[PDB]
Symmetry: C4
Subunit: 485 residues, 4 copies
């Protein structure tokens, strides 16, 4: 009698939502609003990423240009950080950067101009440095001394050194050439949503840190977006317009509703759970069951909770940046990215309503724990090889310098990548270390490819075999499916 | 009695054609004409592709030469599109292209000459552009203004600027140097089927679009094939001859006959099908069978229908191009390519007449659906990682700029390609995004290699196991094989 | 009674040779002489290959040097065949080669000298060539005309052109600069077995074939080994000595003996075979057995026959070259290589005397046929993709030019190699062909990795399962093992 | 009665240590001290490797700088060994190195100075060399003659040759420019544990060995660490301090204790073993058992013995180098590396106390022997291809020069790496060898990927199947587990 009521409640909880409408006619609003969330957050990421793509492309093209203009002897990809080994070359390159700053209106191409105005030279060298290696002696004050100078851009008189730059090269940490420029992007006039002007704050670093007769040279531009006061097109006045704000607000609306409903379904599942527990204990003195208790919990909803939280936070920060017109898009990108990932996994929630898809996702879920355990063991062997190869082959190989590069290399070697370059880039300056490199790599690659990938394949193959055998000959006993039957 | 007649008809429909001649002596003409089609379309593709290969090789060698002649500072592979960052270099390179156009008879090597005659300079810049970034202001007319000029090739007077080219560089979209040249290929005199002369229409694009202080520079030659009026060899007059036309016509003949016969066999299969249905229902009141209805349909014939249609269309377009002597071979190549692919699959029709080959092809066919479903699921996870990596690691990685490049990268990572370059080409300018790159790549590569390829292997392994078990212990019940037995 | 005699003979034929000495004490001479052959042919290949390695290293270092001396603007690896696009550069490079030939005693380093004497210029251009592309007309005599000239090396007067070289560039096929030089290798004085002096016959080819405004440039040296008349060391007279000849003769001895004994064992196996047949038929009227007839044949001996023949032939040619002192080592290398390969497989004959090794080699042999059949089918699909990708993506991809390069690429893609470079090196000049490239590559790589490698793994896994089941539960019935039991 | 005592002893020996405290309350000190050893040796390797990393980085940056200063025309990565092909270039480069040595205080950047003083030129050429290749004759004295010279660094008079260097280039083996410099590292003042000053002993080798008109050029610096007499910071006197010594001593303490206890447990296991043997024989006349005898031996302890020995030796050598302040870290690195590897495997000892981990490690151990046997067979086939490809494709391929490079290549090809570059880097100068290259590579790659990796997967899959079946249906009979039960 009442047992029948419990069977009705439970089966109503275990039936698919599409099955909860063919039988009892409950309108599936939850599926609809989730689908809305999926397409919504997707479109959000797409538009936001296209905008970022245009802005970043503008920035990258610009900084490449500034490198080819201000840095002498720059080559595409010299790690984007070439070095100089001679005093006269340091002087020639500083002079090159300055003279190319003062002729920027005559030599360059783009829409570049000045802050409207100074070019900041900045020496950074030790307060007291007296180094005598020929006598095996030195006296240092690690506290830092600074010097500076400003060239007004309207001074074409000086352009046989002219400016008063003089160096020591015994006490020196870095020279910095700091200045600022302004430009405009013209692909963005077609889209009012983007600010048009852009501020560039450039610094050229001549780094003599890590004294080795090798001065690193780098350029870095830290930028600032700005909204123009006004801008015309064919006589028509125009200012920047915002409509993405309302879109993001509607994202927060949708994800908030989904959050509320999902929490309601979780709490309902827990109340129904304890109801089952207390009812089952009371009626027949039997209730030491834990797996069924988990079966009432549904991790997918939890995935949607984490997803909704991350979408809301990322959207608030997004609105903040589009309002203040900042250019630092790093946290929102990650929150929204992870969110989307979890959302599409939600669609994999919306493929398990088929028994064959159900077979496959259940195979994956059932396999995951044993795979993680075995990844612990193989991770232990992996760590062993990582320390060993790091300490032994660090000095004699381009890789293996840092433990991270080690892990990257060994991982790639498990997955076939870049073997002959590893065998070949080794130095034969020491023969014993070279032999050990060989035993290390043959033993490693053989052990992890020929024995262990094989065992992963054995695991997933075995789980597929079992759950196939369950969809043939029935699941194992649970005492809940018995009660439903 | 009549059931025996049905067994005779059906078994006559289920027996192999080689088996339909050892028993009843029906001459297999269909196999013969299909084989003729196979070798025919193959030889077609080979000859057509060799011709295209010669023409394309001539074009490519030529355009490489024109790049090294007219473009200053060209390097093999600077993406075939090098850039310039300075006004004086733009002037020097325009001047280089012009002076190398006017000295082309004295400096070059090949058989180059002129249209018999103008060198077209063409500026393309805004009608009204007034850009003041120093004041955060600009006024634009996005409508385009054009200017032009023509240098007669017989003007060696001008060769300290001489021509009247002057630029603004604030309003500018592109400069175009358009001209035309004529040449002859001499490997083709040995083959009358090919036209000998070739027209080249060259354009040099100095692109200042996407204003970033970086002017793209490209060369493009759009060509036109031409038949010479006449051409001699050792005193013997010769003009171009065509025999490939008859060949293509015979292709259309063969494929048309195959099309007709195959459609006849499909329609016969459908009439025999409904005959079986109505007969089986009428006799014993049993006919709710759908799998047997499909078993009367044979998809291979359909493959041959699509194949024949594509061969006929591609051959008509082929004859059209060889008649009009055009140089645009893109649609015919694809129709004929896909056609051939389907034809060789037809030969795989002509390997299933052996029970072991039959075991293997049946294994593949039986496995394909479940593989496509699982490719749907894993495609969902794949899309998640694609969006996430796109938005997060777009700005800080050379890959990941566009979703397509993302999908290409992740696909390559599933199949082992180019890992250490992905781990290594990342920028450490932001540490949090870098960590996230690591979790992203380790988690991704591990998840798709160590768990999912394994599951594909489990699927095909399982299907091989089953159908092996069927060729041992017999197929499952169908109620058609029962009637035949 | 007599059946027992047959059991004794047969079991004596089926027992291992080490088992034929523990029981009946037959001295295994065959194993000993085969082992002798293994180590013998191995040592042969090693010494012969080390010698070749020294000679080839000398040649390669030399030709690299001659490239850097005589070819202007040579770069390491410009495909070893750089091109020139300008007349004046052709003149400058010819002049460079000549002047660097006449100053070779003053500019160079090594032990270079002359034939003791001419530098051969050789033009090769059409007899009659009159090409007018501006009028779409041309008259040709494809017969070839030649001109020549000789610069005596002792003419420093000429060194503003001096020599009388003049070109047309409309009729021209190739210019050839042919000459000869002599040198000595000094690593070989330490080894009397090698001739010390070396002759180099150099030709520089300026190839204007395939008229495209691009003249290929290559250097080729065809060499000739020579034995010096005499050579001293510290006052001691020395001439080249040969002892490798006797070694090779002893190789021919060993391999000949093995050949004889193996043929004797094959013929004995055939006589014993027909004896079994006739005896089995005569006694019980039962003899329609073919598998047992094969079981008396042993393919390993055949492998040793082919091996011995190839070792003898390669050794005769080897002795011929060491006698005549030629430098063409291409056929002997291949005969000896294949021979050695088959010999080490012979050692795999000498590992099947263990039941576990026996399990594995039997697994491999039992799997091979079905693998070859399935490689036929998958080869058909492979050919389809090869033709399609060849014709479609030939013009728009650096690969896919020739069917061989296609097969190499697709093979590499099956085995994971070089994906992102294939996706990325495609040209977006045509969007439809680009899309088709994508469907082509995703479909291909997915089909051959995710479904077919899986099936190979299923095959070998299945065979291992079966033969495991036979070493557990006994082999199947043969009616020969029944008679032995 | 007494059998019960034996069951108690044995089960006390077979129970886990954590199980030997939940039941009988034996304090597990061994686990604690081993864990201490794990973290200890780990931290040791980390600190030691970071120090080495700083020192090696300093050295590498330095030698790169010296290359760019003293070697003319040096390029990043010209194999770090560029060559010269002309006399005048040899003179120009020697002159460059000398003049850049004498201006080192004016041209360079770092903290470089002199020994306080000579620049050593050293010719090495034959005593008697008279080579006449034009007459096919030569007379040699392979004994070596040497010449030398010293330029005082304080001689700016000479800087139109000035120094008296003259060469022959017919008799010559090598020129050596040897000198010494002193420098200081400043990242190390922050760490008193490291000596600050560094000695560099530089040699430039112009190698004319292997006479081929190609002089190799290399730079090599052999260094010597030195402790400065004193060094100040902001007026505070400072000398180098050592605390790592005590740490290493405590390593030796821990590993020694572990060594002692482990040997005690092994010997106890052997005494208990023979006790079981003699007792089992005496009581029931049954004792021909060998597997149980091994089951009393535990290889993990042995792994810890080898580990402890290697840690102690490496630590003694470590203390020796930190005391004497040497810079040769090659043996200690390897001993400590292998040690750590074995230690983390020890942690895999500390994961087998779980039955699922136990399933996996037992799967791996049970699979290893058959994998090694099959690696013997496949190694035989591998050797065959190695010899064949070595001798045939040595001269015509960049790889395949040496047998080691062969093995590296073929190994990479088994694991997918670098196929299209192997197919493509072959020379078509000989067509037969090229075809053979194709059959070689297709046959090889197909045979080892499509058939043999498959069989490894079959092996590990089979072992997983079996031991799964044992943890389901119980282990096989041993007659020891019977006695315990
Ligand atoms: C191969 C499959 C079966 C499992 C592989 C496991 C890896 C994905 C994980 C497991 C633990 C990780 C390691 C845990 C800790 C570190 C220390 C970490 O230290 C550093 O930051 C290096 C520089 C420094 O020492 O400061 C470097 C990465 C590394 C080796 C990690 C690299 C990646 C590892 C090996
Ligand atoms: C990994 C195996 C198990 C299945 C992987 C599936 C892929 C072969 C397919 C399935 C769906 C495809 C995606 C469907 C839609 C798009 C959007 C498409 O959008 C663009 O054109 C990018 C530029 C733009 O946004 O305009 C980019 C390719 C992409 C990600 C496709 C890439 C290739 C995908 C992921
Ligand atoms: C992928 C596995 C399952 C089987 C793959 C089979 C390949 C190892 C073989 C089978 C047949 C071979 C093909 C047979 C014939 C030719 C024609 C041959 O024609 C040429 O010589 C190209 C130049 C010309 O047309 O003259 C090019 C190689 C090719 C495609 C071969 C390439 C290598 C193939 C595809
Ligand atoms: Na790979
Ligand atoms: Na792989
Ligand atoms: Na790879």
């Amino acid at each position: 009698l009442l047992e029948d009521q419990m069977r009705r409640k439970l089966k109503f909880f275990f039936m698919n939502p599409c099955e909860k409408f063919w039988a009892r006619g409950r309108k599936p609003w939850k599926l609809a609003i989730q689908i809305l969330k999926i397409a919504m957050v997707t479109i959000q990421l797409v538009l936001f990423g296209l905008s970022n793509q245009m802005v970043v492309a503008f920035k990258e093209e610009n900084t490449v240009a500034f490198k080819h203009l201000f840095l002498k002897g720059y080559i595409d990809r010299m790690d984007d950080t070439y070095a100089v080994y001679t005093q006269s070359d340091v002087y020639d390159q500083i002079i090159f950067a300055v003279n190319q700053y003062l002729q920027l209106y005559q030599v360059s191409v783009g829409n570049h101009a000045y802050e409207n105005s100074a070019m900041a030279i900045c020496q950074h060298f030790y307060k007291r440095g007296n180094i005598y290696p020929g006598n095996d002696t030195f006296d240092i004050d690690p506290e830092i001394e600074t010097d500076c100078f400003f060239v007004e851009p309207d001074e074409p008189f000086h352009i046989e050194n002219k400016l008063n730059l003089t160096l020591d090269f015994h006490r020196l940490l870095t020279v910095e050439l700091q200045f600022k420029l302004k430009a405009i992007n013209l692909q963005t006039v077609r889209h009012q949503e983007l600010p048009d002007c852009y501020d560039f704050t450039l610094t050229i670093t001549f780094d003599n840190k890590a004294h080795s007769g090798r001065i690193k040279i780098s350029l870095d531009n830290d930028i600032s977006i700005r909204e123009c006061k006004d801008w015309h097109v064919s006589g028509s006045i125009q200012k920047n317009t915002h409509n993405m704000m309302i879109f993001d607000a509607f994202v927060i609306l949708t994800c908030l509703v989904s959050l509320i409903l999902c929490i309601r379904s979780v709490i309902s599942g827990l109340q129904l759970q304890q109801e089952f527990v207390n009812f089952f204990l009371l009626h027949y003195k039997k209730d030491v069951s834990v797996s069924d208790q988990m079966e009432f919990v549904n991790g997918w909803y939890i995935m949607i909770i984490i997803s909704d939280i991350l979408t809301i936070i990322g959207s608030i920060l997004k609105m903040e940046i589009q309002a203040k017109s900042l250019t630092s898009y790093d946290v929102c990108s990650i929150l929204l990215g992870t969110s989307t990932m979890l959302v599409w996994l939600g669609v994999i929630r919306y493929l398990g309503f088929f028994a064959k898809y159900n077979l496959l996702i259940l195979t994956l879920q059932a396999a995951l724990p044993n795979v993680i355990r075995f990844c612990c063991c193989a991770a232990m062997i992996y760590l062993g090889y990582c320390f060993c190869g790091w300490i032994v082959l660090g000095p004699y190989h381009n890789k293996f310098r840092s433990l991270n590069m080690v892990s990257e290399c060994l991982f790639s070697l498990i997955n076939g990548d870049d073997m002959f370059a590893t065998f070949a880039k080794m130095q034969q300056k020491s023969y014993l270390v070279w032999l050990f490199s060989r035993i290390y790599l043959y033993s490693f690659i053989s052990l992890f490819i020929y024995m262990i990938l094989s065992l992963f394949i054995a695991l997933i193959t075995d789980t597929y075999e079992t759950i196939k055998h369950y969809q043939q000959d029935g699941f194992p006993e649970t005492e809940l499916r018995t009660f439903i039957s």
